Design an enzyme around this catalytic site. Structure first.
Site, short mmCIF file in Angstrom:
data_model
loop_
_atom_site.label_atom_id
_atom_site.label_comp_id
_atom_site.label_asym_id
_atom_site.label_seq_id
_atom_site.Cartn_x
_atom_site.Cartn_y
_atom_site.Cartn_z
N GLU A 35 0.70 -1.48 -0.02
CA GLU A 35 0.11 0.03 -0.06
C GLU A 35 0.84 1.29 0.02
O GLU A 35 0.60 2.31 -0.74
CB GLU A 35 -0.94 -0.09 1.24
N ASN A 46 -6.66 10.45 -5.58
CA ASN A 46 -7.47 9.57 -6.48
C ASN A 46 -8.05 10.64 -7.50
O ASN A 46 -8.13 11.78 -7.22
CB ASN A 46 -8.38 8.77 -5.67
N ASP A 48 -11.10 10.67 -8.42
CA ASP A 48 -12.43 10.96 -7.94
C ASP A 48 -12.43 12.09 -6.80
O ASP A 48 -13.54 12.50 -6.49
CB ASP A 48 -13.23 9.66 -7.35
N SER A 50 -11.05 11.78 -3.72
CA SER A 50 -10.69 11.46 -2.53
C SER A 50 -9.36 11.23 -2.25
O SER A 50 -8.53 11.22 -3.41
CB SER A 50 -11.71 10.33 -1.95
N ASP A 52 -6.32 8.55 -0.35
CA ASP A 52 -5.96 7.33 0.46
C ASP A 52 -4.78 7.83 1.44
O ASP A 52 -3.87 8.55 0.98
CB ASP A 52 -5.49 6.36 -0.19
N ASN A 59 -8.92 5.23 3.16
CA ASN A 59 -9.53 6.02 2.07
C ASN A 59 -10.65 7.18 2.87
O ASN A 59 -11.08 6.78 3.68
CB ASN A 59 -10.45 5.39 1.12
N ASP A 101 -15.42 -4.82 8.40
CA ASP A 101 -16.62 -4.44 7.89
C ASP A 101 -17.30 -5.21 6.77
O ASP A 101 -18.32 -4.66 6.37
CB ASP A 101 -16.21 -3.06 7.04
#
Length: 129
Positions: A35, A46, A48, A50, A52, A59, A101
């Site tokens: 990562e 990103n 979009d 957003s 990380d 995120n 999750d």
């Protein structure tokens, strides 16, 4: 901060990640390797909009507050800045939520692509913790 591999293993072990929910320490170290390359300051802007954040590239859409929409989401109850600390506390505590999750460690794309299905015990070889 850029961690050494066994330095990070030791920190993650101190924070109760070894075998947390059945995921071995070597899974967590491998995830951090692919990562963030063990860099606590890693960020990925990103397309979009957003981001990380940090050593486990968590995120901002769901897990932390980036300042853009307080009172929304932020399921780890932390500012995204906490994910960029040289100490891994906030990233560990939030990773524990994510991995619970309902997608396990498949929530980490670099883990899926580079760690899943491999002998991840190699990541703690030589650490002799």
């Amino acid at each position: 901060k850029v961690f050494g591999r066994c330095e990070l293993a030791a920190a993650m072990k101190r924070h109760g990640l070894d075998n947390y929910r059945g995921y071995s320490l070597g899974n967590w170290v491998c995830a951090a390797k692919f990562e963030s390359n063990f860099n606590t300051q890693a960020t990925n802007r990103n397309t979009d909009g957003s981001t990380d954040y940090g050593i486990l590239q968590i995120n901002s859409r769901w897990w932390c507050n980036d300042g853009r929409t307080p009172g929304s989401r932020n399921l780890c109850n932390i500012p995204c800045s906490a994910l960029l600390s040289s100490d891994i506390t906030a990233s560990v505590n939030c990773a524990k939520k994510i991995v619970s999750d309902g997608n396990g460690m498949n929530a980490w794309v670099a883990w899926r692509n580079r760690c899943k299905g491999t002998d991840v015990q190699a990541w703690i070889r030589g650490c002799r913790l």
